[PDB]
Structures are given as structure tokens and as C-alpha cells.
Write a protein that binds this ligand. Structure first.
Ligand SMILES: CCCCCCCCCCCCCCCCCC(=O)OC[C@H](COP(=O)(O)OCCN)OC(=O)CCCCCCCCCCCCCCCCC
Ligand SMILES: CCCCCCCCCCCC(=O)OC[C@H](COP(=O)(O)OCC[N+](C)(C)C)OC(=O)CCCCCCCCCCC
Ligand SMILES: CCCCCCCCCCCC(=O)OC[C@H](COP(=O)(O)OCC[N+](C)(C)C)OC(=O)CCCCCCCCCCC
Lengths: 77, 163, 52, 85, 246, 124, 106, 44, 243, 83
């Protein structure tokens, strides 16, 4: 997980509100790489791979939170 | 040279001139002219999409007041959003290709002056419907494409089922 | 028109139409093979991101 | 485009009748020929050949004009009466 | 928006290939029961309509893959629960949009001929004005999704200035929480049902030509537009004209 | 005569021939009329409510009876919505939790102030 | 209701027309259709030797009902004909000179 | 058994044989397989 | 022409000039009854036009439905409704005498009958008359950039402010006004030419002159309704009673 | 199809198969009017164009937010959320 961007630098870089989590620090290089090229999919591939494997690490901590909660639910039951 | 203005004005030329000068220019000229002008329009909108991929900085043009009543103003304002350029390149590409297609598809039909004029007025009110920037210009294009759909589905006025 | 209700002739298509379709078909099967080739683990769905 | 003439309707309707088998034989055919009597048809394979001749020319016949083309010549000029081919 | 973009190119190619085969037949018929085989006679119309239908069936590498499939797994990777049901519904219409598409490729190019012989004598290919836009829109309906996908489906994109609420946004979840089976499923099934419908309509052709009168009643329900225009016509239009005369 | 509203205007006519209403579309197309388009001979008596039996009238389908077709249509609709609603009970549930947000769920970013956090707030 | 006649011939020639045309648009295949066409040809040939009016009319009316149930939504029509799609596209206007209604103005 | 047997022979003969009906079905497959093999060999 | 262009708008002027200044406290008590009567004369008259055998009677019933739209603009207690009723009255006084000229001048001088059943397929001998018929049909409906839509839109908005439910059921006049108008227009323009009508002259210079004036003067109000705000901005505030 | 038509009638969109003899010559006029009108509308609407972002300073919108807070302090107007 990259270091969480501070709030007024979220307002610097005009990150959309659905994109601001502790994965967003790897998103603002990406977008500007995306604006150096013209959103062309052969280019700027290293950095989107970086970002989406942040987002997988986020996804598996989400999955581990849920299976904790299912263990929690049936031991209450 | 104004990219936001040519998108509007070139299909209006492409509509108004086949009607006012159809008897004077004829079908073999007006076909090539109407298609030529829509080709130039869609080349301009590809180039504008290529430029807006550079910076996400859209352009609007402002015109005169529609109505100023007490708490309510409506203006003719036209901007190309990213959403607008997305619909715009699709509708202009399909527009220009259907124009070129109907050169050869309508070769033996009589009334193709009126046909190509109605195709480009359909294109034009679609342009206006998408590039408008209040709900009013959206309504104006929204109604005139239905009027054109009347005039286009009923192209053979002799046929009953078409009417 | 020369025959009726008997065996038809093999058709006459131009050289240019016959070249253009082989170009379009070669382009589609080649492009589809390249995009299966490069997108294979994303395309079929593999190495899924659920943790063990 | 594609024009028909009457030569063509002639050599198509006779072509249609020589590949039909329940005719008497393939050489008592001419334009003058009654399908009832000359070619030995019953009253319903004259209807099968009316169905065949209407699919052959790509046209459609109501019941009160299918009945009266009993000769081959009436069939030829009746099919030549319509603009569709 | 991305599906809206690619669908225009698809359907323009499909409507124009349909117009070229209607224009090429001397009869100018529109019933596909009257078309018969035309693969030998119309290879250019065939290859363009094959590109268009392989794209609309979302077979991969083409534009309809990227536009059409990601909606189907966005139905599953939603946050709300009963969106799972529309996962199947859209998926069902995936399979059906293969089925009729193969019909309008089989009975028009592969079948034994149904028209009279003179149409097959006079079947030729159309002008340059008809063939060139089909060429250009075939190129577009192949390449447009792979070029414009990073514009409309990045995982972080600032192009369209739409503001999704942060909980209604389910994109990061829907590309990662899908099963191997649920993503594998519409691709392989869309290709399997297509190959099966074509092989069954040639080799057997009795499965679709049964004459149970129950299946004929059901077929004529589905033929007359899910009887909707009768329901609209007699019970709203004619009813309204009778009350207006009252 | 045949329709109920045609029966309803029966006592208002006097010195008027009281035609049986027949739709102008369900006539034969191959009988030659004076107008082939309207399918009408030149002095043929017009029904009362003739514009409901004209060529320019509704299309008037032939294949189903109308009560049959209303049964089939409402059939298919309740088939779909009944299968839709029973299929919500047999669903499986999720493999992740719904994702959460920093800065106490972006409430300052979503307009908001501290008295207004529940109205404009996220998961945290 | 009538033995061998011209009017009973009229009736069942048109009925054979109708069932052939009606079987035409159900079947997509060519040889399935023509197997079926020879089959109902056989069906017509097993009859047509009935001399009764009672069961001639009874078979007549129920094959009319059997013909009524296998009816099709779309008949196959050629397009330039009144069911079709090319029907009345460019009706040529009749040659008419201008009738005039005013003494002063056209 | 079929009275229109000599009419409906051309629908099964020379151009609508089973072998000819599947001939243009994949027109550019044979060039694309070798072009793809060339791309596979030229990737390295 | 004088009747449907001026007398109906004269009574529309009289309800502003005579009633709204010294019957304010009465008018507030009675606007639900006016809304009953005006919605009920929009719907039921717009519905009764669908079964009409005669041709000038259709345009008469059209004028009823448009005046019913204008009355719930004046009785709306809103500045928008007052302005939209004035724009509707002026634009209707333009576009409706052109329709009465189409039915009574170009169509009754030539054939001297007014029944709908004789007229079919007027495009193939009279192409510019048919052009006029479709342009005027759409101008009469509430198809925008015409002045009729400006009046109908602002009057429906004022009637939505004063009572939102009768505004909701009064908004369907957009649909109901188009049904009968396009049902007439496609019958007149479409079809094979009539076997009853023998071919006559196309539209003459004076008829085209009257038509062109009455179409430009709707289009100018429809593209810019501000051109007559300079007369009305006092009188749009004058009749409002919002304490 | 080339059925005969009456030459009596004059429509502005042409008639049936309208193809005048001097369609080259008139086409040059239509070419000139179209390019002149497009060029003239192109340059006339130039100063009425502006960009979406970058027009006004952020100083402006910060102090307008401040003055909106001023206009909200003086009327005692409470939030959406607090009840
Ligand atoms: C915003 C305001 C827009 C107003 C634009 C005004 C444009 C008027 C110019 C239209 C004239 C075109 C014309 O004359 O069409 C005549 C047409 C006959 O077509 P033709 O090819 O000559 O065939 C002859 C025998 N049938 O006759 C017809 O078939 C009738 C169809 C006429 C099409 C009119 C097109 C403009 C309609 C705009 C509607 C505006 C609604 C307000
Ligand atoms: C899509 C349908 C549009 C139809 C267009 C029809 C032709 C109208 C062209 C006018 C464009 C124009 O002259 O506009 C440009 C001007 C200026 O604009 P401004 O922003 O208001 O002033 C500048 C404001 N500054 C200083 C902030 C930048 O306008 C006007 O103020 C003049 C209004 C005249 C309108 C009169 C219309 C009368 C009917 C004409 C048609 C019969
Ligand atoms: C859900 C199935 C509903 C059955 C309706 C029906 O009866 O479907 C029949 C159609 C027939 O289509 P056809 O053979 O091409 O032509 C018309 C031939 N008739 C006129 C003889 C019918 O066959 C299909 O498409 C079904 C295959 C797709 C099913 C899902 C895989």
C-alpha cells in the first residue's frame, strides 16, 4: 500500500471522489502518464499494472475482512 | 477557423442549400455536395477529439438570449463535453458513411435531392441535440429529430404503410 | 440466363472484390488471434485475486 | 437492369413443364396445349403446376385467376400481363 | 457510453450489409425464407456481415467483446444483491443474440437455395459507393474498442466528467470479484450455441421444423412481437378512438 | 351492426341505410376497385363510424382473438416478473465487503460539515 | 356437399392452392418441404373418390378447420404485390392537365 | 415418389453442394494462421 | 381569419384587463374552478377532434385547445404564466389564420367541398402546398422554435406552479394536440393522388406571400421571444397578487 | 424505373429526376456561398467561445464562498443536515 495522499493534495490533483482511497497515490502518476500519451493502450502499461496490483492487494484485504465477518456471524448464531 | 462553430454550421449549410437550390443544382450535384460537407464535418470532429485528448478543456460558444423572464434565463449555448464528443464522433461517422452509401443505394430513385436534404437535417438536429448546454437546446434537437423521423419514414408518400 | 432448372454456372466475381474479402478476413482472424494471444490470462480469467 | 420478353416466358414455362413428370410426354408440348386434356393432368396437379409457375416467376395469383389459365398460351400472356418478373 | 459508441459501428455495418443483399436480389425480397444460399455469389457482403455479427456476439478481439461483456459481469460485481438476477437475464439475452444472428447468417449464405434460378443468375455485387462505407465501418467495428478502451475503461479515468457517488461505483470490485466460471461462461457459451445452431440447422433441420401446434402457437406469439402491438392497438388506440367518438 | 358502438348508434340514424361494418383492409386486395389504395368502389355506401373501418384506421390483426392475446400478453409479463421475484430468494451472497473510505468517509469532500455527516457520508 | 362438379372442383382446387401456399412458409428447408408436399399430395389422393354428400361435407369442413389452425403470421409475399415491401413505392402520376378555378389568378 | 424431382435438382448440384456451401465461410483463415505464425516467430 | 386570430385573443386580453386588477381576492378563491374548466376543455375538446369528417372544424377545435392552454397561464398567479399566455395568444394569432387559409383559401377555392374523405395524396401535384401543410402542422403542435411552444411551455409551467397535479394532467396536451394534427396532415399529404380531385393550379403568389409572412412571424418569436419583452415587463408584474 | 412525369409542376426541392444542364455552373455558385457562409460564421462566433476551466481565478471562488458564508451568517440559516 502506497502512503495515503493528504487531503488537499487530493484536491490538487482533482482525483474523482470514488478514486480516493489509500491506492490513489499510484493513480496520479498514471493519469499524467495517460495525459502525456493520448490514452493509447499500448503505451503507459507499467504504471497501470502498478496501480491495479495495489488494487488487488486492497481487494484481498476486503475478502479477508468478509470471511472474518462470516465466522463472526455463525459464532453469534 | 473555429472548431466548435463548424460542427454546427456545416450540416445546416448541408440542409438549407439542397432545399433552396435543389431545382437549380440537381441530384448529381447535391449528392456529392451534401456528402462532401458532412465528410469535412466529421474530419473536423475527429481532429477535435484528438485535441481534447491533449487537455480536458472543453469549448462552448454563446449566442443571444432565448428568453429572460424573472428567475429564468435560457441561452443558446453550445459545448462539446467529453460525453458530447463521444456521441459526436459516432453520429458524424455513421452520418457520413450513410451519406456515401446512399449515393449508390438511391441511384434510380427519383427524389434523392429531398432524401439527402432530409438525411443531413437529421444529422444537423442530432448535432444540436447533443452539443446543447441546457435542457432547452436538448429539447429543441429532441423534437426536431422526431419531425425528421416523420419526414424520413414517410419518404414514399405514395405508400400507405409508410405514412 | 442460358439454362433453366438445371445446374447453375460458377459465378463471376471481380478480381478486386475477391482480393478485398481475403484482406478483410485475414485482418479479422489475425487481429482476433493476436488479441487472444496477448489478453489470454485476462480473457479467460485466471490467477484470480482472492487470497488463499 | 433485367428485361423479360415473351421468348423467355416461353422457354421458362416449357422448361418447367419438361421437368414435371406426371405430364404425358415431353414433346406434345407447344403453346397451344391444354394442361387438362393434352398433357393428361388431373384437376389438382394443374394446381401443383399453378403453384410451381407462380413460384417460378416470383409472382402471386389469387384463386379466381389461377383457375382460368387452363391453356399454356393463356398462362404465358397472363404472366406477361404483370410488371413484376 | 462505450457500448453506445461501439454499437453504432456494428449496427450501421449490419443494416448496410442487409441493404446490399436486399439490393442484390432481383426480386428485392426481404423474407429470409426466400434468400437461400449466397455465399458463392456475395463474398464481400458475407465477410462484412460476418465481421458485424461476430462483433455483436462479443466474440473476443473485436469491439463487442469490450463493449458488451463487461456490462454482463458488472451485473454480478454489483454491490446490491438482486442484481445477481439480472446477471442471468442479460446472460440469457447474450445466448439468444447469438441464435438469431446465426439464423441471419445461415439462411442467407449457407442454406440450400430457396429463390428461383434467375435471381442466382443475376446476383452480382454492388457499386463502389455501397462497398466503401462497409469497408470503412468494418475496420472501425474491428479496431475501435481496442483503441478507445483506455479512454472509456481505464481503472482510473478522468475523461468523462461524470461524478459517481462513491458507493454506487463498483468497477474495481466487479473486475476482481468475478469467478473463473462466471467470466469464462458467456464467452465459451456464446461460441458453443452459435456453432450448435448452425450445425443443427444443416445436419438435421427437423428440430426447428416440428409441427406441434403448441409450439406453433408459441412461435406465432413470439413472431407477432410478443403480442404487444395487438395489445396496444385494440385496447388503447381503438379504445381511445371509440371514446373520442363517444 | 357488428360492433357494440355501431349497435349504440342504431336509434339515432333515420333515412340512413345501416350497413354492416366491414374493415377495408380485410377485403381482398386482388379484386379491382376504383381506388386500389382505399379498396372501395366509387358509389358504395359508407357505414356510420366509417373512419374506424377505413384503410387509414388501425391495423386490426387477424391471427389471434383479442381476449386470447390479452391473456397471452399478461401471461408473458407475469411469467417474467414472477420468475424475477422468486429468483431473488435463491441468490448467493458476496465474496467481499463493500469498500470503505478515508477521511471518515470523505464527508468533507462530499459537501458536508460535522453536524451533517450522516446525510453526506460514506462507509469509513 | 356436392359430387363431381365444376363448383366442388373450384372449392378444392383453391383449398389445395391454400394448403400448398400455407405449407410453403412454415418449412425453411427445400426437401423437408417437398417431402411434406408429396405427403399432403398423398392425403388429397387418398380422398377424391368419395361419392357420399354426408362425409364428403364432414371431411370437407374438418379439413377446412385443419387448414385454419396451421395458419401463418407472415405469408411470403413478393414485394411489389399488395402484401409486400415494394408495393406502391413510386406510383406514376396520371397525366393530367391543370384544371383552373379562377378567372384572374392561376 | 416426388413429382417435381427433375425441377429441384439444381438446388443440390454444382454450387450448392455440401462441399461448396462451406467454402467462403472462413476466407482469410489460411493467410492469418501463417501471418500469426510469422508474428509468433518474430516476437522472439 | 379575423375571428380565430383576434376575437379569442380579445377575450384573453379582457381577462387580464378587466378581472385581475379589481377581483384579486375573488380570483384566488376561484382558480381551482378555472383549472377544472380549462383542463376539462383541453382534454375533452382535444379528444373530440379525432372523429371529425370536415376540415375547417378540425382547426376550430384546435383553436379551442390552444386557448384552454392560455387561460391556465393567465390564471396562474405567476409572471411566467402571464408572459406565456401573451406569447401563446400572439403566436396563435399568427399560425392559426394560416391554417384557415390552407383549408379555406387554397383548398375550398379549388374544389368547393370540405369533407376529409375526398382529399388524399396532395404532394404529387402540389408539392409546396404540402410543404406548407406539414410546416404549419408542426408549428401548430408545440414543436419548438415557433412561438407556440414558448407560449405552451411557459403557460404549462405557470399552471404547474399554481397547482402541480393539474399541471401534470395538463402537460399531456403536448401529446393530444399532436395526435389529431398529424392524423390530418399525413392523410392530406400521403397516399396516391385522389381519384375525386382533378388536378388544379399550385399555390399562387399571394397565397405564398400571406403564408411566408405568417410563418416568419412565428419563427422570429420562436427563435427569440425576447423581442417583445420590452412591452410586457411591467404588465407581467402588474397582475400578480403574492402579498 | 424511369416512368414519365408531368413537367407542369414546380417544386423547390427539384421535382422527380431534377438534373439541370448547367449544374456545374450553378455548383460553383453553391460552392462559393457555402464556403463563404461557413468561413463567415466561423470567424463571427470566435469571441463568443471560451474554455470551461481556467476562466476565473481560484481567488474569486474562495472569496465568493466566503461572502456566501457572510450572507448565510446574517440570516441565521442552518444546514441541510442539522434538524
Ligand atoms: C426551424 C424552421 C425550419 C423551416 C425550414 C423551412 C424549409 C422549407 C423548404 C422545404 C421545401 C422542400 C420542398 O419543396 O419539398 C416538396 C416536397 C416534394 O418533393 P419532390 O422531390 O419535389 O417530389 C415531387 C413530387 N412528389 O413535398 C413533400 O414531399 C412534403 C415534404 C416537405 C419537406 C419540408 C422540409 C422542411 C420541414 C421543416 C419542418 C419545420 C417545422 C416547424
Ligand atoms: C439554433 C437556432 C438558432 C437560429 C439562429 C437564427 C438567426 C439569429 C442569428 C443571431 C446570432 C447573433 O447575432 O448573436 C450574437 C449577438 C451577441 O450575443 P450576446 O451574447 O447576447 O451579446 C454579447 C454579450 N457579451 C458582451 C457578454 C459578450 O446576439 C445578440 O445579442 C443580438 C440579438 C438579435 C436576435 C434577433 C433574432 C431575430 C430573428 C432572426 C432570424 C429570423
Ligand atoms: C426459448 C425457445 C422458444 C421456442 C420458440 C420456437 O418455436 O423457436 C423455433 C425457432 C424456429 O426458427 P427457424 O427454424 O429459423 O424458422 C422458422 C421455422 N418454423 C416456422 C417452422 C418455426 O427455432 C429457434 O430459433 C429455437 C432455437 C433457439 C432456442 C434456444 C437455444
Amino acid at each position: 500500500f502506497p502512503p495515503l495522499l493528504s487531503q488537499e493534495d487530493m484536491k490538487k490533483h482533482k482525483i474523482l471522489l470514488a478514486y480516493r482511497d489509500r491506492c490513489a497515490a499510484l493513480l496520479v502518476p498514471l493519469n499524467e502518464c495517460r495525459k502525456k500519451n493520448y490514452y493509447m493502450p499500448w503505451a503507459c502499461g507499467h504504471e497501470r499494472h502498478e496501480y491495479e496490483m495495489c488494487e488487488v492487494a486492497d481487494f484481498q484485504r476486503r475478502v479477508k475482512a468478509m470471511d472474518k465477518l462470516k465466522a463472526e456471524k455463525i459464532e453469534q448464531a | 477557423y473555429n472548431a466548435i462553430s463548424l460542427i454546427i454550421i456545416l450540416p445546416c449549410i448541408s440542409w438549407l442549400f439542397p432545399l433552396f437550390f435543389g431545382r437549380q443544382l440537381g441530384y448529381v450535384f447535391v449528392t456529392r455536395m451534401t456528402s462532401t460537407l458532412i465528410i469535412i464535418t466529421t474530419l473536423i470532429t475527429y481532429y477535435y477529439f484528438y485535441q481534447l485528448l491533449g487537455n480536458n478543456n472543453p469549448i462552448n460558444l454563446e449566442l443571444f438570449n432565448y428568453l429572460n423572464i424573472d428567475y429564468l434565463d435560457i441561452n443558446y449555448n453550445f459545448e462539446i463535453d467529453a460525453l458530447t464528443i463521444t456521441m459526436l464522433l459516432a453520429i458524424t461517422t455513421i452520418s457520413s458513411m450513410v451519406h456515401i452509401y446512399s449515393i449508390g443505394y438511391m441511384e434510380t430513385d427519383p427524389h434523392q435531392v429531398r432524401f439527402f436534404s432530409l438525411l443531413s437535417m437529421f444529422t444537423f438536429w442530432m448535432i444540436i441535440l447533443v452539443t446543447g448546454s441546457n435542457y432547452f437546446v436538448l429539447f429543441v434537437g429532441w423534437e426536431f429529430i422526431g419531425v425528421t423521423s416523420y419526414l424520413l419514414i414517410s419518404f414514399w408518400v405514395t405508400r400507405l404503410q409508410a405514412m | 440466363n442460358y439454362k433453366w432448372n438445371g445446374p447453375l454456372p460458377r459465378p463471376h466475381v471481380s478480381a478486386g472484390h475477391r482480393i478485398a474479402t481475403k484482406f478483410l478476413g485475414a485482418t479479422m482472424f489475425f487481429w482476433m488471434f493476436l488479441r487472444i494471444k496477448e489478453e489470454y490470462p485476462a480473457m479467460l480469467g485466471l490467477h484470480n485475486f482472492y487470497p488463499p | 437492369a433485367h428485361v423479360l420478353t415473351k421468348d423467355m416466358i416461353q422457354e421458362r414455362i416449357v422448361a418447367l413443364l419438361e421437368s414435371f413428370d406426371k405430364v404425358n410426354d415431353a414433346k406434345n408440348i407447344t403453346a397451344t396445349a391444354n394442361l387438362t386434356s393434352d398433357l393428361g393432368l388431373d384437376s389438382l396437379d394443374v394446381v401443383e403446376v399453378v403453384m410451381a409457375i407462380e413460384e417460378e416467376f416470383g409472382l402471386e395469383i389469387p384463386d379466381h385467376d389461377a383457375d382460368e389459365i387452363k391453356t399454356v398460351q393463356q398462362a404465358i400472356d397472363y404472366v406477361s400481363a404483370q410488371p413484376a418478373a | 457510453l462505450f457500448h453506445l459508441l461501439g454499437h453504432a459501428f456494428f449496427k450501421a455495418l449490419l443494416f448496410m450489409s442487409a441493404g446490399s443483399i436486399i439490393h442484390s436480389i432481383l426480386n428485392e425480397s426481404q423474407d429470409i425464407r426466400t434468400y437461400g444460399g449466397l455465399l458463392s455469389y456475395l463474398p464481400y457482403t458475407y465477410i462484412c456481415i460476418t465481421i458485424a455479427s461476430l462483433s455483436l456476439m462479443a466474440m473476443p478481439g473485436l469491439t463487442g467483446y469490450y463493449t458488451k461483456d463487461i456490462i454482463i459481469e458488472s451485473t454480478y460485481g454489483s454491490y446490491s444483491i438482486s442484481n445477481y438476477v439480472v446477471y442471468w437475464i442479460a446472460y440469457l439475452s447474450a445466448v439468444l443474440t447469438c441464435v438469431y444472428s446465426m439464423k441471419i447468417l445461415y439462411l442467407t449464405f449457407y442454406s440450400n437455395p430457396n429463390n428461383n434460378t434467375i435471381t442466382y443468375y443475376n446476383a452480382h455485387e454492388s457499386n463502389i459507393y455501397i462497398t466503401l462505407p462497409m469497408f470503412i465501418l468494418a475496420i472501425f467495428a474491428m479496431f475501435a474498442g481496442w483503441i478507445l478502451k483506455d479512454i472509456y475503461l481505464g481503472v482510473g479515468t478522468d475523461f468523462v466528467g461524470t461524478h459517481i457517488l462513491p458507493n454506487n461505483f463498483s468497477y474495481f470490485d466487479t473486475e476482481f470479484s468475478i469467478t473463473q466460471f462466471y467470466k469464462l461462461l458467456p464467452l465459451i457459451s456464446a461460441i458453443l450455441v452459435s456453432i450448435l445452431i448452425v450445425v443443427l440447422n444443416e445436419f438435421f433441420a427437423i428440430v426447428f421444423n416440428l409441427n406441434n401446434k403448441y409450439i406453433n402457437t408459441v412461435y406465432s406469439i413470439f413472431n407477432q412481437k410478443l403480442v404487444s402491438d395487438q395489445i396496444l392497438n385494440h385496447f388503447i388506440i381503438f379504445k381511445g378512438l371509440v371514446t373520442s367518438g363517444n | 351492426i357488428r360492433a357494440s358502438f355501431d349497435k349504440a348508434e342504431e336509434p339515432m340514424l333515420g333515412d340512413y341505410p345501416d350497413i354492416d361494418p366491414f374493415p377495408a383492409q380485410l377485403k381482398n386486395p386482388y379484386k379491382k376497385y376504383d381506388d386500389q389504395q382505399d379498396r372501395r368502389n366509387l358509389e358504395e355506401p359508407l357505414s356510420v363510424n366509417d373512419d374506424l373501418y377505413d384503410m387509414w384506421s388501425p391495423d386490426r390483426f387477424t391471427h389471434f382473438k383479442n381476449q386470447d392475446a390479452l391473456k397471452y400478453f399478461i401471461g408473458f409479463l407475469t411469467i417474467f416478473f414472477g420468475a424475477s421475484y422468486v429468483a431473488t430468494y435463491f441468490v448467493p451472497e458476496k465474496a467481499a465487503i463493500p469498500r470503505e473510505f478515508p477521511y471518515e468517509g470523505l464527508w468533507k469532500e462530499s459537501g458536508g460539515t460535522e453536524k451533517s455527516k450522516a446525510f453526506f457520508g460514506q462507509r469509513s | 356437399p356436392v359430387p363431381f362438379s365444376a363448383a366442388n372442383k373450384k372449392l378444392v382446387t383453391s383449398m389445395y392452392r391454400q394448403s400448398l401456399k400455407l405449407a410453403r412458409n412454415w418449412i425453411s428447408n427445400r426437401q423437408l418441404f417437398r417431402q411434406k408436399a408429396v405427403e399432403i399430395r398423398h392425403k388429397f389422393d387418398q380422398n377424391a373418390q368419395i361419392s357420399n354428400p354426408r362425409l364428403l361435407a364432414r371431411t370437407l369442413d374438418e379439413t377446412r378447420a385443419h387448414l385454419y389452425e396451421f395458419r401463418h403470421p407472415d405469408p411470403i409475399v413478393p414485394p411489389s404485390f399488395p402484401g409486400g415491401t415494394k408495393y406502391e413505392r413510386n406510383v406514376p402520376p396520371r397525366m393530367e392537365k391543370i384544371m383552373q378555378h379562377n378567372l384572374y389568378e392561376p | 415418389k416426388d413429382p417435381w424431382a427433375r425441377r429441384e435438382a439444381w438446388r443440390y448440384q454444382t454450387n450448392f453442394t455440401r462441399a461448396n456451401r462451406f467454402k467462403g465461410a472462413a476466407p482469410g483463415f489460411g493467410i492469418a494462421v501463417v501471418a500469426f505464425g510469422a508474428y509468433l516467430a518474430a516476437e522472439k | 381569419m379575423i375571428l380565430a386570430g383576434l376575437i379569442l385573443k380579445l377575450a384573453l386580453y379582457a381577462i387580464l384587463r378587466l378581472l385581475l386588477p379589481l377581483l384579486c381576492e375573488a380570483q384566488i378563491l376561484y382558480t381551482p374552478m378555472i383549472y377544472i374548466i380549462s383542463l376539462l376543455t383541453i382534454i375533452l375538446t382535444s379528444l373530440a377532434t379525432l372523429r371529425q369528417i370536415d376540415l375547417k372544424v378540425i382547426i376550430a377545435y384546435s383553436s379551442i385547445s390552444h386557448m384552454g392552454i392560455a387561460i391556465l397561464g393567465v390564471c396562474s398567479n405567476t409572471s411566467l404564466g402571464i408572459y406565456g399566455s401573451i406569447v401563446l395568444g400572439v403566436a396563435h394569432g399568427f399560425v392559426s389564420p394560416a391554417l384557415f387559409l390552407i383549408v379555406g383559401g387554397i383548398l375550398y377555392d379549388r374544389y368547393h367541398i370540405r369533407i376529409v374523405n375526398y382529399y388524399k395524396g396532395l404532394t404529387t401535384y402540389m408539392p409546396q402546398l404540402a410543404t406548407y401543410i406539414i410546416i404549419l402542422s408542426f408549428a401548430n403542435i408545440g414543436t419548438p422554435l415557433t412561438g407556440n411552444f414558448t407560449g405552451e411551455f411557459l403557460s404549462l409551467q405557470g399552471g404547474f406552479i399554481r397547482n402541480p397535479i393539474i399541471g401534470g394532467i395538463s402537460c399531456i396536451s403536448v401529446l393530444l394536440a399532436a395526435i389529431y394534427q398529424l392524423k390530418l396532415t399525413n392523410k392530406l399529404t400521403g397516399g396516391i393522388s385522389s381519384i375525386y380531385m382533378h388536378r388544379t393550379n399550385d399555390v399562387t403568389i399571394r397565397e405564398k406571400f400571406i403564408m411566408n409572412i405568417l410563418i416568419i412571424s412565428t419563427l422570429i418569436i420562436g427563435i427569440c421571444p425576447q423581442i417583445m419583452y420590452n412591452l410586457l415587463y411591467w404588465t407581467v408584474n402588474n397582475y400578480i397578487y403574492i402579498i | 424505373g424511369r416512368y414519365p412525369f408531368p413537367k407542369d409542376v414546380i417544386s423547390m426541392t427539384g421535382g422527380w429526376w431534377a438534373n439541370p444542364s448547367n449544374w456545374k455552373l450553378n455548383g460553383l455558385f453553391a460552392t462559393g456561398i457555402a464556403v463563404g457562409l461557413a468561413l463567415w460564421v466561423s470567424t463571427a462566433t470566435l469571441p463568443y467561445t471560451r474554455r470551461r476551466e481556467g476562466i476565473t481565478s481560484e481567488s474569486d471562488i474562495s472569496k465568493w464562498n466566503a461572502a456566501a458564508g457572510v450572507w448565510r451568517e446574517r440570516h441565521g440559516k442552518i444546514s441541510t443536515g442539522e434538524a
